[PDB]
Design a protein around this nucleic acid. Structure first.
Lengths: 157, 154, 98, 41, 138, 128, 180, 48, 58, 96
RNA sequence: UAGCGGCGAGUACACUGUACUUGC
RNA sequence: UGCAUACUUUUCCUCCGCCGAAAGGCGUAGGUAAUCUUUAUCAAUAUAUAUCGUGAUGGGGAUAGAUUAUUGCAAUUAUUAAUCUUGAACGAGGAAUGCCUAGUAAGCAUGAUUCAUCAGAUUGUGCUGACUACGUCCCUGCCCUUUGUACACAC
């Protein structure tokens, strides 16, 4: 018998716990859904308790971390993102970039809106980080899903 | 100066038909005349509430407050110490700290309620937890209200 | 039968199913009960370090809660609810007689 | 620095300026004559 | 027979109910005279002078007010009584009078029938008052 | 009538009787109020017709009001820890026993006593 | 029919300056029993003048120090001032105040050379200057606020030297004539 | 150890493990620092 | 002292050091230029100090 | 004077003291303070009356002064007197 | 879990409903 | 009095009935909450009547003294707190300074946050609804076209 507001709080808390656990484990694939291989996860969780934008960001983190060139890696990942079906994409990389002078660079294409309630409701966002030889690399990817129709669109047949 | 043309038909069947201030002062006069309650000998050395912090300077405060308490007792037929405090609440100056209110002292209200219980205007029942007027008090003060109405009407 | 969620589309669809099921099963059912919405708020400030202007943003939790009542069988009602609900909702049961 | 006393249009301020008195003693005189502020008689 | 109407202005709200009678109008238990301000009493009386007491001599307008300030409650009850008398003329007592009724009401002012939506403004940060910015010390 | 002089100035001729009684001592108004109540002097009058009998009644009330109902807690300077018990000791002698307690706290010579000797408030005036 | 404080229907009004009647905008639609009209004042440019002149005065009055917005005292004080003026002077206080506003407001001011005063600005200037006199009188001068209002209003009506409004009007016109 | 079950040392945020900036409204008991970025996933939404 | 009555037929332009002047074709001898302060609408009535004083149109 | 203080018991002692010390002595005395009192009584019974006694090692600033432990100083030489009993210890760095 | 009522039993006045209590 | 141990459930606000000026203390109604605090009503500006009637006054409360109760193992560097005593400026503020266009200025308050105890802080909420433009770049800071630069870590 816990109050309903604190039960919502517990709901959100466990949502965060499961989100971080999924982030930790789901590193050898994309997202095959969640469950409300499997045996160890279910046992650990029970003992404790009682197009894919995030997958593409994880794949780009993998490609950067395993030792491939930044430019070719981003070019190929852009090719895959475009072939997936999204209207546009954006990838931003922050880190050493093979120098002691920090530098950054965006990969934009298409409409690629970034501000507002419709923009947040439409465009999926993701961000990952990894260790490096002399610091940490941040990889942030925004991918817009194809468009209910976008409010600005007007076409009459 | 005080009467105003009331252009709609009156009923005048209870004290809610008559004003609070004139009723409380008039029945304070009635109470002082009839000597139903004592002074009491203990009221006169203490302020009615800490936030007032200063002497009453009226010499009739016990009886006037008692009449107002009877008014409130009918107005809300289930009230007690908390209601009396929050009806008689006043601000307080806490020194260099800013203005902030507080409820008055409770023992004067307790003594007035005790004396009313002794006189048999108010009764205590588990149902309707707050204090309520008895049937005797109801009829007596309804006739008193119509008495005041006809007195100050024509 | 009380219904609680954090989004209103879920309660709309679940209650629509409940009303249509009551209509089909011809039961003695109480009418829609639309509670005043209850919101939960917290005041937060950005800038995890102490350098910068003071800006503060508020958060909202409009939790939706409805009540209904039916004359039916507990097993059949819980069965159709379990069939046609998503666990993002919480439902509790209380029954009528007349 | 007040200089008035009680020892010697009924409005308090006018009476006070008339006899050169304060408003408290002015209202005392008003009561003693007719027999906080309010509409004129 | 019986109708019920509403009135909303500022924070206070009022609910009115017109019934057949002899002219017994009540704001809860107390009169419209004892509420203290003769000032607001004048505005309360304005509908009575702009309609007439002879036609009210046959109707009892049950009224309740709960919340808001004194001025807000006065305006709320004025709006409620305006709408209630409009509806009861529309319904029961006499119909051809209501056109001239609303004519006089609207000519004298448009506030009586429907009240303003001027209510509180949500507070912003940066100062104590909503439209005040924290004092800047260069 | 006006201008009657006592141990403390009572120039309060025009001034009302209660404020005249408070102005001489107990400027907190309230032990003066309780003395006024115990001596039972009416408020409707002014201070221009105050009697020497009334003055004697004031001073008799003031001389150890403990025999009167005036509560121990309502008594100024309740305990003043010692073998005996103290009382409001009227203006000049009140300042004299203020000096008495002050020199006792000097020979106490603690943080707050030396802070005052160095010229500061007790809780911390916060000159920082 | 409608009367101010059940007393004043103001069946007569002086012709004024042929604009002051329109600016004060006192009319059957603007007749009110008492002060404190909470109606809209800020719609158009003329919505400032559309407010009754009595309402302008009473709403201007209460501004000094702690007195911010004490409009209940504004209403009581102005009502008692109407009664005081009616008593000490046999002329209708309404027409007395109308004469005060027709003779008190300055007509030409100087900012850079001089500029004329738009008639709504003249109404507002007269109200503001009578208010300045009232606040000077109520800043620690023994007498009551309603009595001070009686003095100021009667003197601004009769062009008496005891009127701060008339004194400052003479100041303003003298400056304007000496400059432009 | 000399522990007490009140005050700052009685509880710490579940994630940051720091006795600083601890909010207890509706029993969340999570540091605001992490709460700011945890608002979306937990369910907290900013509207006005 | 005295004035001369005038009407407003139009509001010409707002100018001055800080927009505190409004040129007006006000009224004594039909055509007369004036400068006014504050809100003047279409259909106002104003006063004039001297009949034969002229402003400077901008 | 001091004979009654030294003979009379602890509840009347707190009655003598302010309600602050009443609350403190009712709610807590503790092993630290009881061992301190035993140490102080032994030190005062052994040290000669012709010389003032020695301070208390393992110093503390929250030990209430009780007449049943006369003579002690701290290790700032103010002696705890019957006018000192209710002020607790203090006696720390205040150097100007 | 809010109210609008209807009358079921009323407390006092009006007169050819009301201030206040109880339930469906 | 202490340690070791078995049970009710103390661990939220609290109405009420009592004890206590109060502080606070004692027993219990209710509620995991439009159902109990409380909300057919919790503050203050007021409003109306009485004391006072502009005199650094009785305004003002810096100053400190005696303590009562709780909070906390711990309050001494007098946390908080109820009483009683204590009487600093202040005649409305030089040169400068901030903010502001309508339920808003301004005033009056009040909720919550950190909480064993503590708002003078921060964030919401409400009451009293005003004087005034509805424009100008003259000041300050920015945007623009042109121009002149010996300035490019960029007057």
């Amino acid at each position: 018998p816990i109050s309903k507001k604190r039960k919502f709080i517990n709901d959100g808390v466990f949502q965060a716990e499961l989100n971080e656990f999924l982030a930790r484990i789901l590193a050898e694939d994309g997202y095959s859904g969640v469950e409300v291989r499997i045996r160890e996860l279910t046992s650990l969780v029970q003992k404790r308790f009682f197009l894919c934008a995030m997958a593409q960001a994880e794949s780009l983190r993998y490609k950067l971390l395993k030792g491939l060139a930044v430019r070719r890696a981003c070019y190929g990942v852009l090719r895959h993102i475009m072939e997936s079906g999204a209207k546009g994409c954006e990838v931003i990389v922050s880190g050493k970039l093979r120098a002691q002078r920090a530098k950054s660079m965006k990969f934009r294409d298409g409409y690629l809106i970034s501000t507002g309630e419709p923009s947040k409701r439409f465009v999926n966002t993701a961000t990952r980080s990894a260790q490096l030889k002399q610091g940490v690399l941040g990889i942030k990817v925004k991918i817009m899903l194809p468009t209910s129709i976008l409010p600005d669109n007007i076409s009459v047949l | 100066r005080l009467l105003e043309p009331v252009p709609f038909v009156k009923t005048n069947n209870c004290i809610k038909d008559v004003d609070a201030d004139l009723f409380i002062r008039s029945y304070a006069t009635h109470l002082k005349l009839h000597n139903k309650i004592t002074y009491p000998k203990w009221c006169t050395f203490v302020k009615t509430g800490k936030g007032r912090k200063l002497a009453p300077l009226n010499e009739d405060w016990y009886f006037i407050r008692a009449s107002s308490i009877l008014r409130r007792l009918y107005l809300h037929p289930d009230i007690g110490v908390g209601f009396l405090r929050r009806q008689f609440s006043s601000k307080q100056r806490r020194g260099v700290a800013p203005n902030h209110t507080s409820l008055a002292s409770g023992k004067i209200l307790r003594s007035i309620l005790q004396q009313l219980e002794n006189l048999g205007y108010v009764e205590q029942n588990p149902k309707k937890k707050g204090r309520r007027l008895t049937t005797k008090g109801e009829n007596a003060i309804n006739n008193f209200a119509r008495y005041i109405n006809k007195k100050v009407y024509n | 039968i009380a219904l609680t969620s954090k989004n209103l589309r879920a309660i709309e669809k679940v209650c629509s199913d409940i009303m249509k099921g009551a209509k089909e099963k011809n039961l003695n059912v109480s009418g829609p009960v639309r509670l005043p919405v209850k919101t939960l708020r917290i005041t937060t400030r950005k800038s995890p370090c102490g350098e910068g202007t003071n800006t503060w943003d508020r958060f909202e939790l409009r939790i939706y809660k409805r009540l209904i009542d039916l004359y039916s069988q507990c097993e059949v009602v819980t069965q159709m609810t379990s069939i046609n609900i998503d666990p993002v909702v919480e439902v509790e049961v209380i029954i009528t007689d007349s | 620095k007040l200089n008035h006393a009680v020892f010697i249009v009924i409005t308090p301020s006018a009476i006070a300026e008339k006899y050169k008195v304060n408003l408290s003693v002015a209202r005392a005189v008003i009561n003693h004559l007719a027999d906080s502020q309010k509409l004129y008689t | 027979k019986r109708v019920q109407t509403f009135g909303k202005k500022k924070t206070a709200v009022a609910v009115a109910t017109v019934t057949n009678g002899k002219g017994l109008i009540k704001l809860n238990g107390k009169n419209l005279d004892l509420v203290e301000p003769y000032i607001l009493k004048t505005k309360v009386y304005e509908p009575l002078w702009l309609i007439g007491s002879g036609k009210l001599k046959n109707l009892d307008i049950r009224i309740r007010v709960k919340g808001g300030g004194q001025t807000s409650q006065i305006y709320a009850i004025r709006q409620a009584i305006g709408k209630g008398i409009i509806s009861y003329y529309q319904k029961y007592v006499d119909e051809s009078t209501k056109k001239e009724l609303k004519d006089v009401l609207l000519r004298y002012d448009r506030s009586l029938l429907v009240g303003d939506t001027r209510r509180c403004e949500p507070k912003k940060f940066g100062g104590k008052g909503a439209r005040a910015r924290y004092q800047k010390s260069y | 009538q006006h201008i009657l002089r006592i141990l403390n100035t009572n120039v309060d001729g025009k001034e009302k009787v209660i404020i005249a009684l408070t102005a001489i001592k107990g400027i907190g108004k309230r032990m003066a109020t309780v003395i006024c109540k115990q001596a039972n002097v009416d408020p409707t009058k002014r201070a221009g017709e105050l009697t020497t009998e009334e003055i004697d009644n004031i001073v008799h009330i003031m001389s150890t009001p403990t025999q009167f109902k005036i509560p121990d807690w309502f008594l100024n300077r309740r305990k003043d820890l010692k073998e005996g018990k103290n009382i409001h000791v009227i203006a000049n002698q009140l300042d004299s026993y203020l000096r008495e307690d002050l020199e006792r706290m000097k020979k106490i010579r603690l943080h707050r006593g030396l802070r005052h000797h160095w010229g500061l408030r007790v809780r911390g005036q916060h000159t920082k | 029919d409608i009367k101010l404080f059940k007393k004043w229907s103001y069946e007569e009004i002086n012709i004024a300056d042929l604009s002051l009647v329109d600016c004060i905008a006192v009319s059957q639609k603007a007749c009110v029993y008492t002060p404190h009209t909470a109606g809209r004042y800020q719609k158009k440019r003329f919505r400032k003048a559309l407010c009754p002149i009595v309402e302008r005065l009473v709403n201007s009055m209460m501004m000094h120090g702690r007195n911010n917005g004490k409009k209940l005292k504004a209403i009581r004080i102005v009502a008692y001032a109407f009664e005081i003026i009616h008593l000490m002077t046999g002329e209708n206080p309404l027409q007395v105040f109308v004469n005060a506003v027709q003779k008190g407001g300055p007509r030409e001011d100087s900012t850079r050379q001089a500029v004329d005063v738009s008639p709504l600005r003249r109404v507002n200037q007269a109200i503001y200057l009578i208010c300045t006199g009232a606040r000077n009188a109520a800043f620690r001068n023994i007498k009551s606020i309603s009595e001070c209002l009686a003095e100021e209003i009667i003197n601004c009506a009769n062009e008496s030297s005891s009127s701060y409004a008339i004194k400052k009007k003479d100041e303003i016109e003298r400056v304007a004539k000496a400059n432009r | 150890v000399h522990p007490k079950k009140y005050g700052q040392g009685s509880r710490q945020c579940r994630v940051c493990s720091n006795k600083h900036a601890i909010i207890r409204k509706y029993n969340i008991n999570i540091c605001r620092q992490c709460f700011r970025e945890r608002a979306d996933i937990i369910g907290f939404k900013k509207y006005r | 002292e005295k004035s001369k009555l005038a009407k407003v037929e139009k509001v010409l332009g707002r100018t001055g050091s800080r927009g505190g002047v409004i040129q007006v074709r006000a009224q004594f001898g039909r055509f007369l230029i004036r400068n006014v302060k504050g809100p003047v609408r279409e259909g106002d009535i104003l006063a004039l100090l001297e009949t034969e004083r002229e402003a400077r149109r901008l | 004077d001091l004979d009654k203080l030294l003979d009379l018991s602890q509840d009347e002692l707190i009655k003598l003291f302010k309600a602050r010390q009443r609350r403190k002595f009712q709610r807590g005395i503790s092993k630290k303070a009881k061992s301190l009192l035993k140490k102080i009584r032994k030190s005062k019974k052994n040290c000669e009356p012709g010389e003032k006694p020695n301070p208390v090692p393992t110093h503390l600033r929250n030990m209430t002064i009780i007449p049943e432990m006369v003579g002690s100083i701290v290790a700032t030489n103010v002696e705890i007197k019957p006018e000192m009993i209710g002020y607790y210890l203090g006696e720390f760095s205040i150097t100007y």
